[PDB]
Structure 1
Amino acid sequence: MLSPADKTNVKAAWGKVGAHAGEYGAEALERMFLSFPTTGTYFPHFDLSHGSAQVKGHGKKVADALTNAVAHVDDMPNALSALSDLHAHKLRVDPVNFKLLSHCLLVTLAAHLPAEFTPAVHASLDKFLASVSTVLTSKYR
């Protein structure tokens, strides 16, 4: 449950991301694949090599969805219904993995938004990614 401060914190931080979200999407994945190699089991059809167009393209897709979620911070469940469906009924990624991508996205933002990555913003973003995670895994069973 995101507080008003949190929603603010999140909108500010993502606000700074701007035209780079896609690149940050890609970089988070790359960090995820190297750090938690088990996450690769969901992408056997991809080339996980550095700067792979597949990873790149996928980073964009993840970024855009995050953007959309920040924009509908108030109506997440609804803004991401289709994605919750896709993941629950088609992809079927085990829920433990959502914590792994979340962490990699923090790391990525930390490394690129030094001034903006304060302890309070760090707390908000974590809660945010947790909420996004919850929504995407809400129809699993």
Structure 2
Amino acid sequence: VLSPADKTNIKSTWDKIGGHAGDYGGEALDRTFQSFPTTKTYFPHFDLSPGSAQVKAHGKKVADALTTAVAHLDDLPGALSALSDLHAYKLRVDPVNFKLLSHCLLVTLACHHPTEFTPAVHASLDKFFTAVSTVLTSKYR
């Protein structure tokens, strides 16, 4: 359950990241790929070299989904339904990988917005990414 406070934290954070969201999606993937290289294996079709356009373009897609989720915090299941199907049914993403990417999203956010990244907002953002991950892995349950 995203509390009113969580939702406020998530939304103000997203307000703060603004037009960076796309770039942060790409950095978050970059961080995931570098930190947890097994995640690269879901993207054999991607050039995963530095400054990859595919990674950049994909971070933008990931960013956009999170931005959508942020607009629909009440209804992540409904907002992310198509993407649940994609991730479970087509991509068969191992649940562990959502935690890795979520961690890397948090890190990315902490790297860019130290001021906003208070313990409470960290907790809210964590809950946010985990809630998104839960929906993205829901076709496993």
Q: Deviations over 1:84-129 (max 9, x none)?
A: 1111111111111000000000000001011111011000000110
Q: 2:97 and 2:86 mapped to 1: Cα distance?
A: 16
Q: 1:79 and 1:32 mapped to 2: Cα distance?
A: 24
Equivalence for 1:129:
129
CA shift, 1:63, in A, is 0.1
Equivalence for 1:50:
50
CA shift, 1:3, in A, is 0.8
- Which amino acid is the alignment partner of residue 66 of structure 1? L
1:22-37 residue pairs with structure 2 within 5 A? 22-37=22-37
1:1-141 residue pairs with structure 2 within 5 A? 1-141=1-141
Q: 1:68 and 1:120 mapped to 2: Cα distance?
A: 22
Q: 1:80 and 1:17 mapped to 2: Cα distance?
A: 21
* 5+ long unaligned stretches in structure 2: none
TM-score in terms of structure 1 length: 0.98
Report the 3-state secondary structure (helix = DSSP H, G, I; strand = E; otherwise coil) of the residue aligned with 1:2: coil
* 5+ long unaligned stretches in structure 1: none
TM-score in terms of structure 2 length: 0.98
Q: 2:80 and 2:39 mapped to 1: Cα distance?
A: 22
CA shift, 1:81, in A, is 0.7
Q: 1:38 and 1:111 mapped to 2: Cα distance?
A: 23
Q: Deviations over 1:28-77 (max 9, x none)?
A: 11111111011011011111011100000000000000000000001110
CA shift, 1:140, in A, is 2.0
- Which amino acid is the alignment partner of residue 22 of structure 2? G
Runs of at least 4 residues of structure 1 off by over 4 A? none
Tell me how large the CA RMSD over aligned residues is. Answer: 0.7
Q: 1:11 and 1:54 mapped to 2: Cα distance?
A: 27
Paired residues in the alignment total 141
Q: 1:39 and 1:84 mapped to 2: Cα distance?
A: 18
Report the 3-state secondary structure (helix = DSSP H, G, I; strand = E; otherwise coil) of the residue aligned with 1:111: helix
